[PDB]
Design a protein around this ligand. Structure first.
Ligand code: 7TP
Ligand code: CA
Ligand code: ZN
Lengths: 312, 324
C-alpha cells in the first residue's frame, strides 16, 4: 500500500482530465446530449463542487426536453433524481448537489414533495445537523404548503429521540412565531417552551443548544414588571433547579450563566449581590469568556443604576 | 466537548518565510488540477497572503492579469478558470486581485457592474449566477465587489439590506436564506455586508458577539457552529466577525494564537485546517489573516471586511466603519 494508492491517482486524474476535456469539447461544439450526462456523471460523484459541470447537466436537460416526448422527458427527470440521490450519499454537504435538486423539482409539472420530505427525514437521521438538508426541507415544506404545526411536531420527536439538537431548536425558533403571527411569543406558548427546553437541559446539561434557545426564550416575553404569578413562579422554580444542577455539575458554565440570566429576569435589584457572586464563580469556571463576562456584568450594573435613580 | 488536543510538540513559533515559499511554489500536481473549478479564488488567496507577508512581488502580476481578462465572459461576470462559467464568487475574487494589483481596468468594469446588478431579485437577495441559487454569501459578493469598484449605488441597496436582516436569527447570527440556522461563514458574509452598507447598528452586537465567542473550544481554536471541530478558517470567519462588530476581545487571544500556529507544517510550510493535517493555500491565508487580526507584528494589517491588507483599501478609499 505504498506506490499503489498514489500511483493510480495519476490514472484517476487522467480519466477526470479526459472526460472534463471531452465535456468542454462537446459543449463548445453545441452537442447538448446524453454523452455529456454520462461523462459528467463520472466526475460529479467524486467532485460535486465542480459547479460548471452541474450547469452543463442543466443546459443538456433543458435542451433535451425540447426535442423528446413528455414520456422521454419524464424518464430523464426520474434518472436525474436517482443520480442526485447517489451523489448525496457520497457527499451530503455540497451546495451544488442540493441546488441542482431544487432546480430539478422547481420546474416539474407534478413534483412529488411527500417523497422529498421523506428524503429529508432520511438524511436528518444520518446527520441531524445537515444544514443543506434542513434548508432543503424548508424549501420542500413551503412548496407543498406544509403547515407550521406539522414541522413543529417533526421538531419535537427529533429533540427527544437524541441530542445534536441545535438545528431543531433553531427551526422551532422560526416555526413558533409563525404559529402566532404578530407584525413576541404569547405567554402560554412561552411556558410550554420553557417546560420543554427545561427537560432538555436537565436530561443533557452539557448540550449547549438547549441553553442558547432558553436564553432567547428568556427575552421573548413581556417584562419583569408584568410577571404573571405563574411565570414568576416557573422562573423561580427554574432558578432553584439550576442551583441543584450546579451542585451536581459545578464545572457547568451554562447553568451558572442561566442562574445570572434568571435573576435578571426576576428582579435585578433584589438579586444584585447574588448576581455578583455568580459572575465570580462563572469567570472562575469559564476563564476564556472572562472578557465577555465582565462586559455583561458592566451592562447589568449600568441597568441596575438606571433602575435605582428611577426611585422617587 | 468535541475538540482537538494540541500535541505538546506542535509548532509554537511563526514560520513566515516557509509559508512565503509554500505559496510561491504552489502550482508547479494532483490537488491542483482537481481545483481548476475554484482557481480564481485560489489565486486570490495566494496573492493576498503573499501581500500580507510583504512578498507579493514573488508572484506573477503580468501572467495573472491575462488570466483574469480571459476569464471575463461577455455578460460581464468572471469565471474561476478559462472555459468555466461566470459566478459572483469568482467575480469577487477577480476584483479583489485587480484591487491588490491596482489594475482594475484590466477588465470591463461597467460590464461587471451590470452582471452584479442582473443577479438581484425582487426581494433584494442575490443569486450566485444565472442558475438561481440564493445565498447571503452572494449578497456579500455583490456589495463587496461593487464597493471596491465604487459602484454600490448600482444595486437596490435598501432591499438588499432588508433581505439580509430577514436572515437574522434568534441567536443574533445569520444563515444562508430566511429560516437558515446560524453558521460562522454566513455571519462573516452578513456582518461584512452590513459593514459595507453602513448598517451595523442593526446587529445585536452583544448577543451575536456572545454566540461568536462561544465558538472558541478549550484547545483555543474556533469552530463554525456548536458541536463542531474547530478549524483554522472559522478561526478567521469568527474573528473577523467579532472585529467588525467590536468584540474581538471576547475570545482568548493567546489560546487562539497557539492554535493557529500549531496548525502550521514545519516541513512543507503553509497551514492546515487543524494541527498535523495536510496544508493548503486557503487555510494558509486564513491562519495568517487571523494572526494579523490578533495583532501579530510581522504580518500587515488585514481588513476584516474585504480580507485584504488595510493599506490597499486605504489606497482606494473604501474603508467601512466597524462597531468599535
Ligand atoms: C477539500 O475538499 C473541498 C471541499 C469544498 C471545497 S470549496 O471549493 O467548495 N470551498 C473552498 C475550499 C477550498 C479548499 C481548497 C483546497 C485546495 C485549495 C487551494 O486552492 O483550496 C479546501 C476547503 C474548502 N472549503 C471546505 C472547508 C474548508 N474548511 C473546512 N471545510 C469543510 C470551503 C469551500 C467554501 C468556500 C469558501 C470560500 C470561498 O471563497 C469559496 C468557497 C474545496 C475542497
Ligand atoms: Ca513578480
Ligand atoms: Zn476550514
Amino acid at each position: 500500500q505504498a506506490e499503489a494508492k498514489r500511483l493510480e491517482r495519476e490514472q484517476k486524474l487522467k480519466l477526470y482530465q479526459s472526460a472534463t476535456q471531452a465535456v468542454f469539447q462537446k459543449r463548445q461544439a453545441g452537442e447538448l446530449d446524453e454523452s455529456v450526462l454520462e461523462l459528467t456523471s463520472q466526475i460529479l460523484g467524486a467532485n460535486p463542487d465542480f459547479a460548471t459541470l452541474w450547469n452543463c447537466r442543466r443546459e443538456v436537460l433543458q435542451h433535451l426536453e425540447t426535442e423528446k416526448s413528455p414520456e422521454e422527458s419524464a424518464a430523464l427527470v426520474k434518472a436525474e433524481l436517482g443520480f442526485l440521490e447517489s451523489c448525496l450519499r457520497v457527499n451530503p454537504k455540497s451546495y451544488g448537489t442540493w441546488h441542482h435538486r431544487c432546480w430539478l423539482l422547481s420546474r416539474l409539472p407534478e413534483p412529488n414533495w411527500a417523497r422529498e420530505l421523506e428524503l429529508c427525514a432520511r438524511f436528518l437521521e444520518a446527520d441531524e445537523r445537515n444544514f443543506h438538508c434542513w434548508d432543503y426541507r424548508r424549501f420542500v415544506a413551503a412548496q407543498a404548503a406544509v403547515a407550521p404545526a406539522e414541522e413543529l411536531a417533526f421538531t419535537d420527536s427529533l429533540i427527544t429521540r437524541n441530542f445534536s439538537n441545535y438545528s431543531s431548536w433553531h427551526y422551532r425558533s422560526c416555526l413558533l412565531p409563525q404559529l402566532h403571527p404578530q407584525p413576541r411569543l404569547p405567554e402560554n406558548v412561552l411556558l410550554k417552551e420553557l417546560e420543554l427546553v427545561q427537560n432538555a437541559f436537565f436530561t443533557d446539561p452539557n448540550d449547549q443548544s438547549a441553553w442558547f434557545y432558553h436564553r432567547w426564550l428568556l427575552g421573548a416575553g413581556s417584562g419583569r414588571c408584568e410577571l404573571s404569578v405563574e411565570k414568576s413562579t416557573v422562573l423561580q422554580s427554574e432558578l432553584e433547579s439550576c442551583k441543584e444542577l450546579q451542585e451536581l455539575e459545578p464545572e457547568n458554565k451554562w447553568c451558572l450563566l442561566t442562574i445570572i440570566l434568571l435573576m435578571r429576569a426576576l428582579d435585578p435589584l433584589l438579586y444584585e449581590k447574588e448576581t455578583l457572586q455568580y459572575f465570580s464563580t462563572l469567570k472562575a469556571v469559564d476563564p476564556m469568556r472572562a472578557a465577555y463576562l465582565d462586559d455583561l456584568r458592566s451592562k447589568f450594573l449600568l441597568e441596575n443604576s438606571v433602575l435605582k435613580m428611577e426611585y422617587a | 466537548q468535541k475538540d482537538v488536543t494540541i500535541k505538546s510538540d506542535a509548532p509554537d513559533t511563526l514560520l513566515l518565510e516557509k509559508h512565503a515559499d509554500y505559496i510561491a511554489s504552489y502550482g508547479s500536481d494532483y490537488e491542483y488540477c482537481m481545483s481548476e473549478y475554484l482557481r480564481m479564488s485560489g489565486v486570490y488567496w495566494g496573492l493576498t497572503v503573499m501581500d500580507l507577508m510583504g512578498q507579493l512581488h514573488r508572484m506573477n502580476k503580468e501572467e495573472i492579469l491575462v488570466f483574469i481578462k480571459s476569464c471575463q465572459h461577455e455578460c460581464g461576470g468572471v469565471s474561476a478558470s478559462i472555459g468555466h462559467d461566470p459566478h459572483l464568487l469568482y467575480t469577487l475574487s477577480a476584483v479583489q486581485i485587480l484591487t491588490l494589483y491596482d489594475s482594475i481596468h484590466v477588465i470591463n468594469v461597467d460590464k461587471v457592474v451590470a452582471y452584479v446588478q442582473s443577479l438581484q431579485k425582487e426581494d433584494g437577495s442575490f443569486a450566485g449566477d444565472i442558475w438561481g441559487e440564493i445565498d447571503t454569501r452572494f449578497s456579500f459578493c455583490a456589495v463587496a465587489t461593487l464597493a471596491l469598484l465604487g459602484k454600490l449605488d448600482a444595486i437596490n441597496v435598501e432591499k438588499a439590506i432588508e433581505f439580509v436582516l430577514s436572515c437574522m436569527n434568534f441567536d443574533g447570527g445569520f444563515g444562508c436564506r430566511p429560516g437558515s440556522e446560524s453558521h460562522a461563514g454566513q455571519i462573516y458574509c452578513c456582518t461584512g455586508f452590513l459593514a459595507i452598507t453602513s448598517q451595523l447598528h442593526q446587529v445585536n452586537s452583544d448577543l451575536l458577539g456572545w454566540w461568536l465567542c462561544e465558538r472558541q473550544l478549550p484547545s483555543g481554536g474556533l469552530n463554525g457552529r456548536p458541536e463542531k471541530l474547530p478549524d483554522v478558517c472559522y478561526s478567521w470567519w469568527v474573528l473577523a466577525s467579532l472585529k467588525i462588530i467590536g468584540r474581538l476581545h471576547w475570545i482568548d487571544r493567546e489560546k487562539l494564537r497557539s492554535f493557529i500556529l500549531a496548525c502550521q507544517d514545519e516541513e512543507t510550510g503553509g497551514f492546515a485546517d487543524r494541527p498535523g493535517d495536510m496544508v493548503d493555500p486557503f487555510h494558509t491565508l486564513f491562519g495568517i489573516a487571523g494572526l494579523s487580526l490578533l495583532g501579530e507584528e510581522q504580518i500587515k494589517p488585514v481588513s476584516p471586511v474585504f480580507c485584504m491588507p488595510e493599506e490597499v483599501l486605504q489606497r482606494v478609499n473604501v474603508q467601512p466603519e466597524l462597531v468599535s
